[PDB]
Amino acid sequence: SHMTYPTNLEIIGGQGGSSFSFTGENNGASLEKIWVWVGGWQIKAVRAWLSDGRDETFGVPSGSHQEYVFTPGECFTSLSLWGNGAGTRLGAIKFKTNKGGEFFAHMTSWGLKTEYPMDVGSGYCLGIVGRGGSDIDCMGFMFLNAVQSTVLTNVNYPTINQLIPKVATEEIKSVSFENKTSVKQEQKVETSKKVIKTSSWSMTKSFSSTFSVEVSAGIPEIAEVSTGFSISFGVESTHSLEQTDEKNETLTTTVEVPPKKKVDVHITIGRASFDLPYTGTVKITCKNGSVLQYETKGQYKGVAYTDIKVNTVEKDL
Amino acid sequence: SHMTYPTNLEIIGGQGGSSFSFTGENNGASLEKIWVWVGGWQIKAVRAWLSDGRDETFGVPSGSHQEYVFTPGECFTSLSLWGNGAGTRLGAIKFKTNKGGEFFAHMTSWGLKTEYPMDVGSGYCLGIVGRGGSDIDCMGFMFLNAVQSTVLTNVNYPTINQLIPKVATEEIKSVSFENKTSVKQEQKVETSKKVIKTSSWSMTKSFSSTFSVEVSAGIPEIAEVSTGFSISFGVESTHSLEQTDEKNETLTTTVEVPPKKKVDVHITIGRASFDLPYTGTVKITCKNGSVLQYETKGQYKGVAYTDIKVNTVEKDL
Numbered sequence: 137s138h139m140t141y142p143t144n145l146e147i148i149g150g151q152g153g154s155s156f157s158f159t160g161e162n163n164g165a166s167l168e169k170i171w172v173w174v175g176g177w178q179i180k181a182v183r184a185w186l187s188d189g190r191d192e193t194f195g196v197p198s199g200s201h202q203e204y205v206f207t208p209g210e211c212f213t214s215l216s217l218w219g220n221g222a223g224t225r226l227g228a229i230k231f232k233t234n235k236g237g238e239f240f241a242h243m244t245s246w247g248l249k250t251e252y253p254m255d256v257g258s259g260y261c262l263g264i265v266g267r268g269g270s271d272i273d274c275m276g277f278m279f280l281n282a283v284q285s286t287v288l289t290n291v292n293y294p295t296i297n298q299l300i301p302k303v304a305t306e307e308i309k310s311v312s313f314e315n316k317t318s319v320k321q322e323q324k325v326e327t328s329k330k331v332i333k334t335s336s337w338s339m340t341k342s343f344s345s346t347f348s349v350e351v352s353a354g355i356p357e358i359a360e361v362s363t364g365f366s367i368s369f370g371v372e373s374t375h376s377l378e379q380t381d382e383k384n385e386t387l388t389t390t391v392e393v394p395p396k397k398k399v400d401v402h403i404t405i406g407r408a409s410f411d412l413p414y415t416g417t418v419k420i421t422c423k424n425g426s427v428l429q430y431e432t433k434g435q436y437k438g439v440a441y442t443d444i445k446v447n448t449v450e451k452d453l
Numbered sequence: 454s455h456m457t458y459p460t461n462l463e464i465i466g467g468q469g470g471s472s473f474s475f476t477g478e479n480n481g482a483s484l485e486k487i488w489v490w491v492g493g494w495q496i497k498a499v500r501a502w503l504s505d506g507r508d509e510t511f512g513v514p515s516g517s518h519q520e521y522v523f524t525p526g527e528c529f530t531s532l533s534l535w536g537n538g539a540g541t542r543l544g545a546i547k548f549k550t551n552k553g554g555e556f557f558a559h560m561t562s563w564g565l566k567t568e569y570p571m572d573v574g575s576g577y578c579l580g581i582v583g584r585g586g587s588d589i590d591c592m593g594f595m596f597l598n599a600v601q602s603t604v605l606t607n608v609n610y611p612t613i614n615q616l617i618p619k620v621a622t623e624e625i626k627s628v629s630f631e632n633k634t635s636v637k638q639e640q641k642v643e644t645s646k647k648v649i650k651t652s653s654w655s656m657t658k659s660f661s662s663t664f665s666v667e668v669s670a671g672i673p674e675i676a677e678v679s680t681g682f683s684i685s686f687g688v689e690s691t692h693s694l695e696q697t698d699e700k701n702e703t704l705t706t707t708v709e710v711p712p713k714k715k716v717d718v719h720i721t722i723g724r725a726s727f728d729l730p731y732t733g734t735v736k737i738t739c740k741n742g743s744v745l746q747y748e749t750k751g752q753y754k755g756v757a758y759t760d761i762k763v764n765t766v767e768k769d770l
């Protein structure tokens with residue numbers, strides 16, 4: 137049998153110190169900044185920040201540090217690690233990024249020996265894992281493996297049943313008919329109106345800049361019933377994380393004009409702006425068949441419309 | 454027995470003066486600005502500007518004018534005209550728009566008699582038609598009737614075969630493998646890369662703000678061939694006027710690593726941004742079955758990508 141994993145991690149160095157694990161495996165967070173302190177025959181310490189705000193130091197800093205700051209969407213293209221030649225510490229880190237950056241931090245006295253080039257997977261670095269004490273005994277960088285799909289699913293809007301939506305009226309057209317005869321009359325009125333419907337689900341920028349996130353979700357919809365407006369949780373379908381859809385809404389109406397009456401026809405549409413929290417599950421499927429999933433929450437913003445409405449008012453003359 | 458038309462025009466007033474027709478039915482231009490001069494027993498004159506820059510005056514101005522300036526997307530919601538009550542001149546114009554505006558210009562001495570409320574169709578005003586001399590003898594506002602669909606089709610890119618595409622390399626990943634044994638080795642490498650493809654076809658903003666324009670067109674594509682970068686006119690399909698499609702592009706590669714050899718693998722993708730002219734036909738189908746079409750020209754802008762490329766280099770160590 138053959139085992140695959142959604143992350144790629146190759147740890148280099150010795151067996152001393154105490155284990156550490158500092159990664160976004162739980163929530164999709166990525167490595168956002170790293171400080172590296174070197175010594176004569178080791179990497180001395182590493183401080184790392186993840187995109188979710190976590191910040192931890194391993195080993196004991198001495199001297200000044202080298203820094204690398206990753207921008208959202210910046211991924212590794214390559215990584216090599218060296219031990220210290222004696223098999224007892226990490227000795228050097230070298231990487232390059234898809235934004236043209238390079239970084240090289242190495243011990244200062246002892247010469248570098250065997251280079252270990254790594255497969256960065258997708259290039260999205262989830263953090264670092266190794267062992268430290270006084271120094272960095274060993275370390276590796278964890279990557280998400282190449283991705284087949286990244287999907288936001290199991291979406292809920294937990295406040296949707298409490299929400300009272302503000303629905304603004306857009307006038308489309310009004311016209312007046314006059315029936316001076318003693319028999320009812322029929323008038324056809326055709327209406328068209330462009331509507332622009334939008335949906336967006338917020339996501340940490342690092343993740344959404346690196347991966348094309350598809351959304352499997354119902355969205356909020358708006359309708360006008362007898363008792364007023366009603367919000368509903370629509371049927372689940374596929375969306376992009378930010379989605380806009382234009383269409384020409386149309387309607388054909390037959391207006392009845394009673395004898396000796398004026399009828400005014402008022403044709404309108406209601407526009408609603410949703411701004412409410414959502415929860416869901418991010419499901420990553422790797423090319424190698426493995427999966428990584430985690431729960432998330434953010435803000436849904438949406439613009440939705442009612443059906444075109446026709447109201448008629450009758451008057452004399 | 455029954456004729457329908459893509460335009461709706463009801464002329465009110467008398468039979469004197471000379472005929473005029475000032476409308477965008479040739480090119481989809483709309484009424485952008487109107488000045489109206491009134492007199493005691495008539496509308497005296499009207500000056501009109503269409504969205505394509507045309508500007509004409511009908512009748513002979515006297516005194517100050519009233520103005521209405523339409524913004525892109527602003528459509529009529531209602532319109533009423535009055536004669537001067539004697540059947541010899543236009544007497545008043547009243548309209549309301551979908552941005553909440555209202556305008557009422559009327560003769561100043563004689564009182565208004567019969568109101569003629571009009572059906573504004575889609576609300577998109579193409580211009581004015583009537584008869585003028587000293588005064589406005591008669592006039593009507595021409596509207597596009599309610600729309601079923603509006604499509605940009607028959608799209609060509611007249612320069613596409615002359616264009617030399619500027620393709621930027623984006624690095625995805627590099628890794629090295631070593632084979633110290635005297636027997637063949639294989640290494641599987643999987644790659645994923647987010648690509649964001651875009652297409653946009655420029656259009657006069659008054660039209661595209663009012664109508665949901667679908668595009669039935671092929672789009673420029675880019676490929677890597679033996680000599681260099683081959684552009685091509687892709688297969689026809691449906692798009693929106695500004696479109697974005699993101700995807701995780703992926704590839705699995707089996708790398709052969711010979712005995713006593715080092716193989717470096719360099720994985721890239723090419724991104725090109727097209728900027729070139731297009732021609733096509735705007736076809737409007739009204740709800741009543743009629744059609745208005747006209748030829749148009751604009752600028753297409755597109756971002757497109759090559760396939761993921763794998764470059765393999767053999768070293769000896």
Ligand SMILES: OC[C@H]1O[C@H](O[C@H]2[C@@H](O)[C@H](O)[C@@H](CO)O[C@@H]2O)[C@@H](O)[C@@H](O)[C@@H]1O
Pocket residue numbers: 151152153154268269270271272273
């Ligand atoms: O990270 C290196 C090393 O750090 C700690 O050991 C330190 C010290 O306490 C020891 O006396 C000496 C000798 O071995 O070395 C270090 O300075 C420990 O955490 C150790 O496990 C670790 O390898």
Ligand SMILES: OC[C@H]1O[C@H](O[C@H]2[C@@H](O)[C@H](O)[C@@H](CO)O[C@@H]2O)[C@@H](O)[C@@H](O)[C@@H]1O
Pocket residue numbers: 468469470471585586587588589590
């Ligand atoms: O637009 C009104 C009227 O204008 C012109 O006629 C003017 C003038 O030339 C005539 O002498 C007098 C009297 O008949 O009326 C106007 O002042 C013409 O273009 C006419 O056809 C038009 O109705």
Ligand SMILES: [Cl-]
Pocket residue numbers: 149218219220221222223224
């Ligand atoms: Cl070593």
Ligand SMILES: [Cl-]
Pocket residue numbers: 466535536537538539540541542
């Ligand atoms: Cl009249």
